[PDB]
Design a protein around this ligand. Structure first.
Ligand SMILES: [Mn+2]
Ligand SMILES: [N+]
Length: 128
């Protein structure tokens, strides 16, 4: 994928965002910004420039599932890739994410290898 691809990393906890940001850097992606909930995320997304969202599940103000649905229903942002992160693979979460059109899911805690594989799966599928 293009190393200038701009990522938005969304989580209400700084430590989780820092993990993802560092992993993206290791993979060669330095164009990365952070958001602390779904509303903060949409505010950044609608300001423009983003090509990929990595979002947690549970957040105040607007949670990750709601963020995903809002993105998918948006007349402009509908196609934006969104990788959802879930604390544990409760089948209901995984199912809900799939139904709502998530690009992929990853269960935390996750290894660097797992995130890399998940991202590449999405890139390759989308011809990125
Ligand atoms: Mn959370
Ligand atoms: N939700």
């Amino acid at each position: 994928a293009d190393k200038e691809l701009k990522f938005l990393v969304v989580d209400d906890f700084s430590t989780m965002r820092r993990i993802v940001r560092n992993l993206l850097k290791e993979l060669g992606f330095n164009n990365v910004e952070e958001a602390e909930d779904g509303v903060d995320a949409l505010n950044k997304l609608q300001a423009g420039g983003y090509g990929f969202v990595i979002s947690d599940w549970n957040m105040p103000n607007m949670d990750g599932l709601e963020l995903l649905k809002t993105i998918r229903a948006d007349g402009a942002m509908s196609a934006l890739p969104v990788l959802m992160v879930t604390a544990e693979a409760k089948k209901e979460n995984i199912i809900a994410a799939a139904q709502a059109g998530a690009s992929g899911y990853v269960v935390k805690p996750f290894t660097p290898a797992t995130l890399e594989e998940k991202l590449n799966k999405i890139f390759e599928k989308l011809g990125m």
